[PDB]
């Protein structure tokens, strides 16, 4: 169905404050932006437009401010543009693009039987599979998105059948995913929104094969979002065969 809408965010007018007055939050927070029409980072969770539910979790977890790497990455994401976020391995990245991933799926038809994820993001680990999922769980348990890990080093059995149950949003490690892929235990043809996370790592533990394989299974049209801690010729390659027109936000030098 070649007809999918990812928005475009637009910020409260709260957040009308063009002056270099974002340059000081930035080089503040040692941001550093590379692309065309790069939205001005939300300083508030309200100046993002994001549903009741997911806010309401947000207090629950009492938090003080949307990290650097929020507050710029989820306008960009909520606008539907393609993204690279070079930030330190382990930050706080997993809910940069998780949150407009739940809003993105709402725009959306519910999921028929039969229909794989809608939002799918690869991991080059079990560790962060899981800790995406654990800071995930929370807002998809908050929501009617159901979420699942699947990784190489557990039962096949929980896996294929949190799948067969349905979740629309799919955690995964490479080669883990590609088993499940070539066996009818899922499918990416109702996925609209990529995140591959830690592609540095993943890129050097040899995934680079599986992960295109996996892509040129994907709508070229979707939005996608990428993660590196180093930004080396082979994540700026795999950035030009997979993202377009893409932002380039740094954080991490």
Known sequence: PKFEKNFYQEHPDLARRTAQEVETYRRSKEITVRGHNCPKPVLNFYEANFPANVMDVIARQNFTEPTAIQAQGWPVALSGLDMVGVAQTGSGKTLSYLLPAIVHINHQPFLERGDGPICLVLAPTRELAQQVQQVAAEYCRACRLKSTCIYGGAPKGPQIRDLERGVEICIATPGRLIDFLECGKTNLRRTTYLVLD??????????????????????????????????????????????????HINIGA
């Not at 996608?224 to 065969?241: F, G, H, N, Y």
């Open 198 to 247: 830690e592609a540095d790592r993943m890129l050097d533990m040899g995934f680079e094969p599986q992960i295109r394989k996996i892509v040129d299974q994907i709508r070229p049209d979707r939005q996608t979002l990428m993660w590196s801690a180093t930004w080396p010729k082979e994540v700026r390659q795999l950035a030009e065969d997979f993202l377009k027109d893409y932002i």
